[PDB]
Write a protein that binds this ligand. Structure first.
Ligand SMILES: [Cl-]
Ligand SMILES: [Cl-]
Ligand SMILES: [Cl-]
Ligand SMILES: [Cl-]
Ligand SMILES: [Cl-]
Lengths: 321, 325
């Protein structure tokens, strides 16, 4: 069983990566270039239950970053809430482009090996209007000096730095979510790239309202995808975590002062927020907390890798019974 | 960058192809050998590497081509010796004791016999039908250079039992297989210079009338107990054909035609012309001045549709990776 969803059908993978550049629109009147359609796709991982455990495991060893899954779960950041669906970390290349590999995988089930997303980011930074991105970043930086913005720009390039590409940071995630017109939520031990990145350069009416969910640990991003057909739990990611006996909101990055004053209203415009009951620290109490709905799997026939990988799996499982 | 082995190019499609094979097998109730209904008619061709640059060619060749067998067979003047004819190229094949089947399966379908469909069909024939005529023909051939004991061992060798991962197959197993496929198999084998390899030669599906058989051969190479498919290279004006004789110094030596009865051998040329499309090609003489006509069989055009062609998916991957400079 191949070690990556893409590998079940390398031909189709190339076809997927080939569609991506053509789906990018470049308005050329100041507005940021963005995806026309492909940002609306979501991958889900197939179950490995309803299989033997010896076999359930084999699949899990090939596709899943178990090191990062265990770390994030042991710190109570990933899959802490018993009411919601389990998320699973998919293996991602650690070459310095993992932000883009994880994001590309979450939507399209391929990594960014043609550097389409990485180049799109660099393009926007080196070309488009970045006045407001810079203001937001100064404002966030001062909440704790200026060749810094210029080097943040150079970091997004494809230049060799010691990994093969420069590592990316919070502002790059924020720019990326505006290129995708889709929120990105990062689950990490510091939840400082952990937290919620909203496409605030766009009206929420022009954005996809289900997030991309990534995990982050040790300078490495992975996608955290939903596992298919494991109801009855809620298909959402909580927008808070337990922290020292209370619920603490995930950080929302790069807000202006007026945005911050209406943080909850913004989350509710850019995500599908639902208020769900979870168990209290007092076993006699329940609390309502906010969560954002996750998308159902929708990668079409032609560009759905995971159904190809799953078909391989079913074939070898029959042989392995 | 590029995959290192053909099958990596579309594993889902390989599975689809493999899954089709057992359902194409027809099993008669009247004692007739089980055989393929439709899939035996398929033939792969390899794509050209000429349009690319040496560092790139090197990677496509290391990935796909068995260059050791290709060089062994060419250096003996057994493979690619006629200037009249299109080049054949040896594809890498898994060396697990099932390579007769992997090579045969690749020649037709671009996949190896990794579900053991061909290997099982061979064993099932040997194990579950009357094999009296196969046994007779094998006896005559054995004597031309305890019968019950030895026949049982050859049936046993055909099984999927570990002895490699499987028992190596030999000539009678190729003859059985060509009758399951209703398609001749021609083996081009390593062989000591005569001045100083019995698996080499021509296997005809003599349990069928020629009109019920496909009349383009499967072409395999053999060396160091390993089979590979020798697939035609896309190119003519050169013509698609495989010579049915070898040079032997200043003369020619017919490829061996295996397992014939006595009257069949007396009419061997007639028989070859029934089961193959035998043409004559002029070659330079290594004794007399000029030139001599030798027999060759025509080889099939590529007909393995894209839908079931790893090599086509492979080539498109090469195109993509190439344009990246
Ligand atoms: Cl909970
Ligand atoms: Cl939308
Ligand atoms: Cl707590
Ligand atoms: Cl409580
Ligand atoms: Cl011979």
């Amino acid at each position: 069983l191949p070690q990556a969803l893409y590998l079940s059908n390398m031909r189709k993978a190339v076809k997927i990566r080939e569609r991506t550049p053509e789906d990018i629109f470049k308005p050329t009147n100041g507005i940021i270039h963005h995806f026309k359609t492909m940002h609306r796709y979501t991958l889900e991982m197939f179950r490995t239950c309803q299989f033997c455990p010896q076999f359930r495991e084999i699949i899990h060893k090939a596709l899943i970053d178990r090191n990062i899954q265990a770390t994030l779960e042991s710190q109570k950041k990933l899959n802490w809430c018993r009411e919601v669906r389990k998320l699973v970390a998919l293996k991602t290349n650690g070459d310095g482009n993992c932000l883009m590999h994880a994001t590309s995988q979450y939507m399209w089930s391929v990594q960014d090996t043609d550097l389409v997303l990485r180049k799109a980011l660099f393009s926007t930074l080196k070309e488009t209007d970045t006045r407001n991105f810079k203001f937001r970043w100064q404002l966030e930086s001062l909440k704790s000096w200026n060749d810094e913005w210029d080097n943040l720009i150079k970091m997004a390039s494809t230049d060799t730095p010691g990994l093969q590409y420069n590592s990316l940071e919070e502002i790059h995630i924020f720019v990326l979510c505006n290129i995708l017109r889709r929120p990105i939520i990062v689950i990490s031990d510091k939840m400082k790239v952990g937290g919620i990145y909203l496409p605030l350069h766009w009206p929420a009416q022009e954005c996809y309202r289900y997030p991309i969910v990534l995990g982050y640990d040790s300078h490495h991003f992975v996608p955290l995808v939903t596992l298919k057909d494991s109801g009855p739990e809620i298909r959402a990611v909580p927008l808070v975590n337990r922290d020292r006996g209370r619920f603490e909101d995930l950080k929302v990055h790069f807000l202006t002062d007026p945005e911050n004053e209406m943080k909850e209203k913004l989350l509710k415009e850019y995500l599908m927020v639902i208020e769900i009951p979870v168990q209290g620290w007092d076993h006699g109490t329940t609390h309502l907390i906010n969560a954002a709905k996750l998308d159902e799997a929708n990668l079409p026939k032609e560009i759905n890798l995971v159904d190809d990988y799953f078909e391989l799996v079913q074939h070898e499982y029959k042989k392995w019974q």
